[PDB]
Design a protein around this ligand. Structure first.
Ligand code: 733
Ligand code: HSX
Length: 239
């Protein structure tokens, strides 16, 4: 008998991949040059192997968190929601700005799936828990929750956030941003959350869910700002 989850399994070559990503990142970001990637992988693995893939906690990821400590300039943070492809394109241009995935820990896991199983050191390449159908506390979900929190707490000055203007929910309170990030911005260091709405011809800052974002933020004594981005590709140049 082998247990079958609703979600897709661990990505093939996942151990080999994460390790290789760590080696590459260290090579190209000179300040990380002396990070031990085998120790980093071992701490990643350590967080989820031999554990039921539904009893994962944030503490499990702390050994890895500590190894992948990176405090980027907090005034240079770019958050995003659902519209990740464009946000990375952006930081591949501006290049002083940072999304989570341009940090080591996020770079290591972006687009990847992993999970283990109780009591053995094996990795499940056949399936992993679905956040909806099976478990909210899986290894992937707990990973992003944990780093999303630390990332957003770090932030300062003006934090900019990208949102998708073709979605029915421009701001989703149940997304990683609406659920974890927004609530961890510190009023001490963050003055403004500036929202960018990307039109994938009318003013989408008026939107109800944007107005709802304005409420969450306003109640943290942080100022809110919203700008339409009519022609997206034109923004990429005019930066
Ligand atoms: C696969 C994945 C999942 C991410 N977060 C899931 C999620 C949602 Cl949608 C809502 C609430 C919570 Cl607490 C959680 Cl954990 C996720 C989040 C990111 F910020 C980034 C990625 C990514 N780059 O792959 C991500 N991926
Ligand atoms: C933290 O979470 C957002 C992306 O998650 P969504 O579920 O909101 O797309 C990203 O900006 C990270 O900084």
């Amino acid at each position: 008998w082998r247990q079958q989850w609703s979600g897709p399994g661990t990505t093939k070559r996942f151990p080999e991949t994460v390790l290789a990503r760590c080696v590459k990142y260290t090579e190209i970001h000179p300040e990380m040059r002396h990070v031990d990637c085998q120790s980093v992988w071992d701490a990643f693995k350590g967080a989820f192997i031999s554990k039921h893939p539904c009893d994962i906690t944030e503490e499990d990821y702390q050994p890895l968190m500590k190894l992948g400590t990176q405090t980027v300039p907090c005034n240079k943070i770019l958050l995003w929601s659902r519209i990740k492809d464009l946000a990375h394109q952006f930081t591949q241009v501006q290049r002083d700005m940072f999304t989570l995935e341009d940090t080591l820990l996020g770079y290591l896991a972006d687009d990847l799936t992993w999970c283990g199983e109780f009591a053995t050191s094996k990795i499940n390449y056949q399936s992993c828990p679905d956040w909806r159908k099976d478990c909210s506390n899986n290894p992937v979900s707990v990973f992003w929750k944990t780093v999303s929190r630390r990332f957003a707490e770090a932030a300062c000055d003006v934090v900019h956030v990208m949102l998708d203007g073709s979605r029915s929910k421009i701001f989703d309170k149940d997304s990683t941003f609406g659920s974890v990030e927004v609530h961890n911005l510190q009023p001490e260091k963050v003055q403004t959350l500036e929202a960018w709405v990307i039109h994938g011809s009318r003013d989408l800052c008026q939107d109800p869910t944007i107005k709802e974002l304005e409420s969450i933020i306003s109640k943290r004594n942080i100022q809110f700002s919203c700008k339409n981005i009519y022609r997206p590709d034109k923004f990429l140049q005019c930066v």
